[PDB]
Amino acid sequence: VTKCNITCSKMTSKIPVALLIHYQQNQASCGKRAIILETRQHRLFCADPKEQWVKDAMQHLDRQ
């Protein structure tokens, strides 16, 4: 169940915390972890959780 569907190949770069309303990660069966960032406009972006700014952004997004 819940196989890898939506995933990431290459990752974006910094996206201002002000624009993010949400995140989710891809499915564990996808392999590497990819963070799916969602803008207020509901644009979806792929981000590398290994990045400080992504860690940073999840923190804030959770801490709200």
Add this chain to the structure above:
Amino acid sequence: VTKCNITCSKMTSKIPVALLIHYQQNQASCGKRAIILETRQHRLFCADPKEQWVKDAMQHLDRQ
């Protein structure tokens, strides 16, 4: 952009459009076109754009 970022591979069955709040296609460099659809509850699916219902949903979503 230059390379394949978000993409998906498991193509759903017709999802009622009421439930939908956004779509975005993957990048050309991903090869095959795939539509990432997002429901109101924020679940992500993958849609085959060859299907009329998908074309219809994107046109509708665009009408907004």
Add this chain to the structure above:
Amino acid sequence: VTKCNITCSKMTSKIPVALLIHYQQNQASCGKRAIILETRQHRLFCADPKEQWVKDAMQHLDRQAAALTR
């Protein structure tokens, strides 16, 4: 799991199931179970889970979401 914030006092009579797009229950902390129904217009209503129509409505909704998993 948490404190009780939103709760229900007077319950709403049957709503045509076609108008319903979502439900959730209050918190266990609250005591009595209350179902919060959301309509297409996104109005929130309080319904009594002891009522067959609310049970039917939750199953309908859950079946919808289930179908989407495939």
Add this chain to the structure above:
Amino acid sequence: VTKCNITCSKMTSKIPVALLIHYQQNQASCGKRAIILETRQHRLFCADPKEQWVKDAMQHLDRQ
């Protein structure tokens, strides 16, 4: 004929309006006014309409 249906006790600190998707006041028969706030993630909170961020929140949603 119109009775107190949903209402709530504990209020909430200024929630980012970008997370809000909906509001509704409680019924007049509940007594004091409380605003029920719904987030993108569809969580439900109570807000005090005397606070300016709540009024602001309501006006924004009204335009949304």
